[PDB]
Amino acid sequence: MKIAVIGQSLFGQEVYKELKNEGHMIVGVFTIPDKDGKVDPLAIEAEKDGVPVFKFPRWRLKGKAITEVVDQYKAVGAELNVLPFCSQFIPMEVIDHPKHGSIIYHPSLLPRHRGASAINWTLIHGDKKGGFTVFWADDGLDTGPILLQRECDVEPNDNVNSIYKRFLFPEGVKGMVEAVRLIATGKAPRIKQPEEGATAECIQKKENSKIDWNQPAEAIHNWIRGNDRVPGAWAEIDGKSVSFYGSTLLENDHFSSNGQPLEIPGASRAALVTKNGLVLFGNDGKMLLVKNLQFEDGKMIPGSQYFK
């Protein structure tokens, strides 16, 4: 069928590539403008194939759809919109235009974790199960009826990168391909999202990923891994913003060490720089271990190497 891919990232690129390879006609790719002279992976592949690329800065202006860009969109004659990691606001005029409307990839088990940082919140909340949903876009945010859903276990030390690389990305690509298959072959369902279990959270940015120290060790562990790598949980240390990566919980066989104390403003007590990384305390007397630290615009350095 005729598909417009509206989105970005290597995930968007892979979904484009697999749909193409399944015999679908990609009539257009609609992605973000160039930033720092880097073209989005989705745009790179499309161009290589001669598929038309569009890079709208915005689809809307003062609460009204920009007719000139909507018209460019409508001209490619999509029969279905596919939205992998679309970071743009898409007018309902566009969402509803194709005969099959639009499907969206969402990296959580809807109705839980609506919002653009669902992977982060899956981990921040310490969920035991995670996964993704392919759903039909409606006018709300991640509220449309479910086409399909796939689950995975969340590992205790999973960060955003590990669960994304292990499951959400490669199975997510397959799920999108399968969803289009079901649509083409005419049997895709529209399961209304249940009310029970619905949650919605905010977008994670550097600013709001600052560590709140007045939590138990386990919650701090979840906070750090839930923002690792991006945007990077951080705290001020010695006047400067330090980001934390590679968290594990630490309970026992202590205090071997001997650690070198590191004051962290707001921490329940001083941290310990040790051979195995940076030991941090929660407000419950318990410990976590951070393997890697990063300063602003910085390369990562091992927690063990803080004073060197």
Author numbering: 1 to 308
Text from the published report:
10-Formyltetrahydrofolate dehydrogenase (FDH), which is composed of a small N-terminal domain (Nt-FDH) and a large C-terminal domain, is an abundant folate enzyme in the liver and converts 10-formyltetrahydrofolate (10-FTHF) to tetrahydrofolate (THF) and CO2. Nt-FDH alone possesses a hydrolase activity, which converts 10-FTHF to THF and formate in the presence of β-mercaptoethanol. The N-terminal hydrolase domain of FDH (Nt-FDH) binds folate and is homologous to glycinamide ribonucleotide formyltransferase (GART) and methionyl-tRNA formyltransferase (FMT), enzymes that are crucial for de novo purine biosynthesis and translation initiation, respectively. In this study, we determined crystal structures of zebrafish wild-type apo Nt-FDH (zNt-FDH) and its ternary complexes with the substrate 10-formyl-5,8-dideazafolate (10-FDDF) and the products tetrahydrofolate (THF) and formate.
The activity assay shows that the hydrolase activities of the F89A, R114A and Y200A zNt-FDH mutants decreased significantly in comparison to that of zNt-FDH_WT. We co-crystallized or soaked crystals of the mutant (Y200A) with the product THF, but we observed no clear extra electron density in the active sites of the structures. Our results suggest that Tyr200 might play a crucial role in the release of products. Finally, from our structures, we have identified a new key residue Tyr200 that might be involved in product release, product inhibition and additional THF binding.
